[PDB]
Amino acid sequence: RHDSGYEVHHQKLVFFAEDVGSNKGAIIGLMVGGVV
Amino acid sequence: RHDSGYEVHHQKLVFFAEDVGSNKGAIIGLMVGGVV
Amino acid sequence: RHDSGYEVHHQKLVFFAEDVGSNKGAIIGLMVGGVV
Amino acid sequence: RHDSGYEVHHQKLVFFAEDVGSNKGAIIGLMVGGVV
Amino acid sequence: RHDSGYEVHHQKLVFFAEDVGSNKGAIIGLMVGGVV
């Protein structure tokens, strides 16, 4: 038996980020995996 | 038996970040894995 | 038996960061694994 | 029996950071594993 | 029996940092394993 009240089994998140363009400026409060 | 009140079994996060462009400036409050 | 109140079994985080572009300046408050 | 109130079994974090570009300046408040 | 109030079993952190680019200046408040 498991008897869980709150449960989450599997969550898969895949992020692909590629940047070829140049001359770009940014201001980010909090950046996880994105490309600037 | 497990008897858990709150539980999370598996969570997979994959981040791919590539940067080829140049001449880019940024200001980041908190950066985890992203490319600048 | 396990009898846990709060529990987290497995969490996998994968970060890939590559930087080929040049001439880039940044200011980061807190950087974990990202490339500048 | 385990009888844990708060528990975390396994958490895996993988960070890959590569930098080929040049001429880049940064200011980091706190850097863990990222490349500048 | 274990009877733990707060517990953390295993946490694995892997950091890969490589730097090929040149001419880069940085100011770091606190650096753990990152490359400058």
Author numbering:
A (entry chain E), B (entry chain D), C (entry chain C), D (entry chain B), E (entry chain A): 5 to 40
Which of the paper's sentences describe this entry?
The major pathological hallmark of AD is the accumulation and deposition of amyloid-beta (Aβ) peptides (amyloid plaques) outside neurons, followed by the formation of intra-neuronal tangles of the protein Tau, the loss of synaptic function, neuronal death, and irreversible damage of the brain tissue. We investigated Aβ40 fibrils formed from this monomeric Aβ40 in the presence of negatively charged liposomes composed of 1,2-dimyristoyl-sn-glycero-3-phosphoglycerol (DMPG) by magic-angle sample spinning NMR spectroscopy and cryo-EM. Here we present the cryo-electron microscopy (cryo-EM) structures of six lipidic Aβ40 fibrils that assemble from three filament folds, providing structural insights into fibril–lipid interactions. Indeed, the three lipidic Aβ folds are identical in the central β-strand formed by residues Q15 to A21, with only minor differences in the sidechain rotamers, but they differ in the conformation of the N- and C-termini.
L2 and L3 fibrils each consist of a single protofilament and reveal two alternative lipid-induced protofilament folds. While all 40 amino acids were successfully modeled into the cryo-EM map of the L3 fibril, the N-terminal residues of the L2 fibril are not well resolved, suggesting a higher degree of flexibility in this region. The cross-sections again reveal lipid densities at the fibril surfaces in the neighborhood of hydrophobic residues. In particular, the C-terminus adopts a curled, shell-like conformation in both L2 and L3 fibrils, stabilized by interactions between D23 and K28, as well as by hydrophobic intra-subunit interactions. However, intra-protofilament interactions between Y10 and Q15 in the L3 fibril result in a compact conformation with two consecutive 90° bends of the protein backbone. The absence of this interaction results in a more extended conformation in the L2 fibril. Conversely, L2 and L3 structures consist of only one molecule per layer.
